[PDB]
Design a protein around this motif. Structure first.
Motif, PDB file in Angstrom:
ATOM      1  N   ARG B 129       0.782  -1.225   0.000  1.00  0.00           N
ATOM      2  CA  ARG B 129       0.000   0.000   0.000  1.00  0.00           C
ATOM      3  C   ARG B 129       0.823   1.290   0.000  1.00  0.00           C
ATOM      4  N   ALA B 130       0.346   2.275  -0.753  1.00  0.00           N
ATOM      5  CA  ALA B 130       1.018   3.562  -0.850  1.00  0.00           C
ATOM      6  C   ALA B 130       0.264   4.586  -0.039  1.00  0.00           C
ATOM      7  N   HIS B 131       1.012   5.422   0.674  1.00  0.00           N
ATOM      8  CA  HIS B 131       0.434   6.492   1.487  1.00  0.00           C
ATOM      9  C   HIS B 131       0.944   7.785   0.886  1.00  0.00           C
ATOM     10  N   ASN B 132       0.056   8.478   0.185  1.00  0.00           N
ATOM     11  CA  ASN B 132       0.392   9.728  -0.477  1.00  0.00           C
ATOM     12  C   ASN B 132       1.494   9.532  -1.525  1.00  0.00           C
ATOM     13  N   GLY B 133       1.431   8.412  -2.246  1.00  0.00           N
ATOM     14  CA  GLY B 133       2.410   8.125  -3.280  1.00  0.00           C
ATOM     15  C   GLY B 133       3.602   7.309  -2.815  1.00  0.00           C
ATOM     16  N   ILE B 134       3.809   7.235  -1.506  1.00  0.00           N
ATOM     17  CA  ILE B 134       4.935   6.488  -0.960  1.00  0.00           C
ATOM     18  C   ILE B 134       4.508   5.133  -0.381  1.00  0.00           C
ATOM     19  N   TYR B 135       5.136   4.072  -0.872  1.00  0.00           N
ATOM     20  CA  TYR B 135       4.840   2.719  -0.416  1.00  0.00           C
ATOM     21  C   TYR B 135       6.050   2.076   0.253  1.00  0.00           C
TER      22      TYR B 135
END
Lengths: 363, 363
Positions: B129-135
């Motif tokens: 999963r990515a959080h604001n584009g960051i995984y």
């Protein structure tokens, strides 16, 4: 041997009979009329089928796996579907199906494997086996072939689309791979557009309304009336509606709609569909991220998301004005089509204002 | 709260530490060496992670669904994977994992949901999963990102390919819709080709061999040694091998291979894979229909089938000469590659002559 005998009949004699009958109906001036015309061919169809069915209500409980059962249910359903077409059986006219043998066997198998006890879309489309290029069909009419073939293509395309959308759930709307999935979804949706356009420009409006549609009518299995199979009788198209957030499971009108079609699709699809009802949707994710408007992933993925939605609504309006407007529950149909196209409404809820709000976010 | 705390650590401090450490290793002349270099950062990584894990071995049994469990297993596995990289833990050097807390939790969850008790491919690829584009990731190195991203794309493409092949089983090799599925399979296989070529032409051979690969090493979880995750650790690529008939489940060498990777993929994939082992394959279907050589469906579908096969072998040789030849069991690795490419082999059994027989059939 009996099961194989019934299948061979469906793939041979069954076709000849319905075909010869369609030729008689298409001659008369009424053309839709069935009363007095081919009462001889009708008896042969009913009689031959019934005997094959009776010879089956003996080894039609041995359980040879799900695929065999569903396939057998198909033939019985196909037979009963034709009988309804030639009005050898009629819902309102009757209080219970006059086809006792076929009904008992149909209800036995359907309840056994978890599907409606009649002919379902998958029987002629995605799960219709071909023997040397020839697969199940009612008649040998070229127009029936165009309808089935393009429905199958459209259905498979909708599945490719839903499959890609589902794979986004674990990645998140901000993951870069989600852009690719969104693109894969777009292509699949375009295949649906192209596939349908092809059908609408090659199908004989008259041959279809008088020689094809009448086989998709509602009929009784036992004492219950079961409506006819629809092109939307599969997980795919519904999975898209929920995942994109264009429809709402929290509304009686929609949930009831899904409940009325679960049995009309494969068990696998039913489970996948049910799950979508209790999962987050992409629409609401992009809305909750209204602040990340300046983020690269936001504007890149949102743009694609929006195109996918307007693309899905596009196929909703076309399908409606082609297979509906041309050929009571019409309001509910317009409702569903308006939800898919996120059209501006005030009598019901629609993602029109939300979708518009998002499009303006990207400026 | 604890679970969320551990995840936040993996997505922040965890990355900084591994990155700073990679900078130290990449400086030295050896570069592969780890003995004496960043013994201070290693303690911080081990110590911080361990405390977060211990604070989790309390509410890490409440069962919050499969996704949450697998995700938690991922973080623990990611932590243990880094420890193996920085040789804070070593297989042969030890008799049992020195990481007691993390091992007990990992084995608890894995056995609970039916997956290996360590970092698996899906944790960084399809289910990251990515959080604001960051995984999730080990380091912030651009090359790790190229490896993960393109592996994910390649993996998703393989799934689109296998999905289309499976949908042929109920239609038959002679059904006209099968041609479309075969075409869909071809496109997906081409995306794999393109996807890999992209990776091979953008990846820094040195940065990958010294800063990325070492995180995919085998390590102990408890007293058992678990090898590292592979790009082929999913149903897709294997489904294709069996369905196209390029591999044989009736051979000990292959079945054993599948048995050694079932736990390394998602439960869903394991079931789909297992089923393929007891189903007919397209290769043998086209061979049993050698007589229908003059049929339109035969020459139209066979032609496409053949292209799909040669296309799959093509991606097998490229992948091999790129991620293997550059960076004992090499024999088996080569045998599999020869199977997929159907290359002429006198040692083992290959579909080389069968495929040759089919091509010549088309004259």
């Amino acid at each position: 041997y009996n099961t194989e005998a019934f299948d061979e009949w469906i793939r041979s004699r069954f076709v000849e009979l319905n075909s010869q009958l369609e030729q008689l109906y298409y001659q008369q001036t009424d053309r839709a009329n069935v009363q007095e015309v081919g009462t001889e061919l009708k008896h042969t169809l009913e009689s031959e089928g019934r005997e094959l069915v009776k010879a089956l209500l003996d080894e039609g409980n041995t359980d040879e796996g799900f695929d065999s059962a569903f396939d057998l249910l198909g033939n019985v359903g196909l037979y009963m579907a034709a009988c309804r077409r030639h009005e050898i059986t009629e819902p309102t006219r009757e209080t219970t199906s006059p086809l006792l043998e076929a009904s008992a066997l149909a209800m036995h198998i359907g309840a056994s494997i978890g599907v409606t006890p009649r002919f379902a879309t998958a029987h002629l489309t995605t799960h219709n086996r071909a023997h040397n290029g020839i697969y199940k069909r009612f008649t040998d009419l070229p127009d029936e072939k165009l309808f089935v073939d393009y429905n199958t293509k459209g259905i498979l395309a909708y599945k490719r689309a839903s499959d890609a959308l589902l794979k986004i759930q674990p990645l998140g709307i901000s993951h870069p791979i989600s852009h690719d999935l969104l693109r894969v979804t777009k292509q699949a949706l375009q295949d649906v557009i192209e596939s349908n356009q092809q059908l609408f420009n090659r199908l004989d409006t008259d041959r279809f309304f008088y020689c094809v549609r009448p086989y998709y009518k509602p009929y009784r299995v036992g004492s219950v009336v079961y409506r006819g199979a629809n092109a939307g009788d599969f997980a795919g198209i519904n999975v898209i509606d929920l995942t994109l957030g264009l429809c709402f499971a929290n509304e009686a009108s929609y949930s009831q709609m899904l409940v009325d079609k679960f049995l009309y699709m494969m068990p696998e699809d039913q489970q996948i569909l049910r799950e979508c009802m209790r999962r987050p949707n992409l629409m609401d994710d992009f809305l909750q991220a209204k602040g990340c408007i300046h983020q690269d992933w936001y504007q890149e993925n949102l743009k694609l998301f929006i195109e996918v939605c307007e693309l899905h609504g596009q196929t909703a309006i076309q399908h409606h004005n082609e297979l509906v407007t041309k050929y009571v529950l019409l309001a509910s149909l317009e409702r569903l089509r308006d939800r898919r196209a996120a059209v501006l409404r005030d009598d019901i809820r629609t993602r029109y204002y939300d979708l518009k709000k998002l499009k303006d976010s990207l400026r």
